[PDB]
Amino acid sequence: LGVFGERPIANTEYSGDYAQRDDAKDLSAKIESMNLSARCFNCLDKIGIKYVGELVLMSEEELKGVKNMGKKSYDEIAEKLNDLGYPVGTELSPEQRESLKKRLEKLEDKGGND
């Protein structure tokens, strides 16, 4: 216990529009389309998150929960998700996501798992 010490680098503390949803048309894209590093995409592909829609449907608690996430890799994941308009994990009025999941099922037929 104590009242003195030293700290790491400061946060950006930036702010903007709370959320936006008109850009959710672009979610049929490959996650690779946002110029990610391959280590990020090689995480996302193995859990089966192959599209920006699937990353957008990866709510923050799922997103923290891959097996080989990598510190830099999640950060550029989240900021290239943010480049669409919505930084990943903003899940406070998500009800459009069930409509997304049903539309995403029609990007292409492929298979299933259990």
Tokens 């990007």, residue located: 107
Q: What is the 3-state secondary structure (H, E, C) of 13-52?
A: CCCCCCCCCHHHHHHHCEHHHHCCCHHHHHHHHHHCCCEH
Q: Closest by alpha carbon to 95, among 60, 57, 65, 67?
A: 57
Question: Please, which residues have CB within 8 angstroms of residue 38's CB and are 6 or more apart in sequence?
Answer: none
- Phi and psi at 51, nearest 5°, equal -130, 160
* Token duo for residue 35: 């110029």
The 8-class DSSP code of residue 21 comes to -
Domain spans of the chain?
A: 1-114
CB count in 10 Å sphere of residue 24: 19
Contact by Cβ (8 Å): 81, 88? yes
> Hunting for tokens 């308009």 — which residue is that?
85
CA–CA separation, 44 and 32 (whole Å): 10
